[PDB]
Amino acid sequence: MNIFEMLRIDEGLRLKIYKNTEGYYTIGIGHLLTKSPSLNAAKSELDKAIGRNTNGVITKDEAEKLFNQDVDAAVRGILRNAKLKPVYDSLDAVRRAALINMVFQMGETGVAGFTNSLRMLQQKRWDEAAVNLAKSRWYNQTPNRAKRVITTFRTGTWDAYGSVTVVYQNGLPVISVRLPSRRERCQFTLKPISDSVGVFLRQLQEEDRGIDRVAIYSPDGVRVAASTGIDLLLLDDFKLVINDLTYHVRPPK
């Protein structure tokens, strides 16, 4: 796990302008366009960002370029800020990623305003920082996101950011999945010649009653039909969305 994978889990991929949970126009991998309720303002910002007339639609490659630019802008925002830089410098790699995640989401200025939480992080008062961060407007607005980021600060581990992997055993694909109701993964063995996407998704839901939504998408963000054979699915990478989280899956061969 690293900052790039972490943010992709949090943000997913959308190639057309959409409204985020706060009602604001967004595209790509969490690229906020504007807080104004004007779709034409969103498109104008997008066209500047991409360098062409997009009409509200971009390619995966354009989304990824924008994402890399936004991660770089977040890190630069930290390093140039007198309140964020010494906190960042003091933190281990995992907690640094949590701070970058915050800055990516809410901007340099918003995060620099968390004076007390920043002091607590600087002083390695992790439980206190976690308690204090949860009292914020940020947490109130996007609590599932903020819980994951707070867990990362509290523990200095990737406990909130799991992974989905595929390994062949006895000639069959075994898919290990982070489910929302348990910390340790569960493994699913599938029959490629007869099981479908929909079969797999139904097994996930049978396993964890805390799953409210599950779906599979192509690497370009296009929904994969339930009838699709697992053999066909495993010919390429895919995304497995479980509740609010988007996991990238890389099958071997």
Residue numbers in the entry: 1 to 163, 1075 to 1164
Question: What text appears in the publication on this structure?
Answer:
The mitochondrial calcium uniporter (MCU) is responsible for mitochondrial calcium uptake and homeostasis. MCU consists of two conserved transmembrane helices (TMs) connected by a 9‐aa linker with a four‐residue “DIME” motif flanked by an N‐terminal domain (NTD) and C‐terminal domain located within the mitochondrial matrix 11, 12, 13. MCU is associated with many regulatory proteins such as mitochondrial calcium uptake‐1 and mitochondrial calcium uptake‐2 (MICU1 and MICU2), an MCU paralog (MCUb), and essential MCU regulator (EMRE), forming the mitochondrial calcium uniporter complex (uniplex) 3, 4, 5, 6, 7. MCU NTD appears to be essential for the regulation of mitochondrial Ca2+ uptake through interaction with regulator(s) and/or modulation of post‐translational modifications.
To elucidate the structural basis for MCU functions, we designed a set of human MCU truncation experiments for crystallographic and biochemical studies. We determined the first structure, at a 1.80 Å resolution, of the highly conserved NTD of MCU, corresponding to residues 75–165, encoded by exons 3 and 4, fused with the bacteriophage T4 lysozyme at the N‐terminal end of the MCU NTD. The T4 lysozyme fusion was used to enhance solubility and to phase a new crystal structure using molecular replacement. The structure of MCU NTD consists of one α‐helix and six β‐strands that form a central core, two highly conserved loops (L2 and L4) and one leucine‐rich short α‐helix (α2). Hydrophobic residues in the α2‐helix (140GIDLLL145) stabilize the hydrophobic interior of MCU NTD through interactions among V108, I127 and F149. The L2 and L4 loops are stabilized by hydrogen bonds and hydrophobic interaction formed by highly conserved L90, S92, R93, E95, E118, D119, I122 and one water molecule (W1). S92 located in the L2 loop forms a hydrogen bond with D119 located in L4 loop, stabilizing the local structure in these loops. S92 is predicted as a potential CaMKII phosphorylation site 23, and we could expect that S92 phosphorylation induces conformational changes by breaking the hydrogen bonds in these loops and modulates MCU function 23, 24. The MCU NTD core domain contains six β‐strands and one α‐helix in the following order: β4‐β5‐β6‐α1‐β1‐β2‐β3, in which each of the three β‐strands forms two β‐sheets (A‐ and B‐sides). In the crystals of T4 lysozyme‐MCU NTD and MCU NTD‐E, MCU NTDs form helical oligomers around the 65 screw axis in a similar manner. We identified MCU NTD as a novel fold and named it “MCU domain‐like fold” superfamily based on the analysis of the Structural Classification of Proteins 2 (SCOP2) 27.
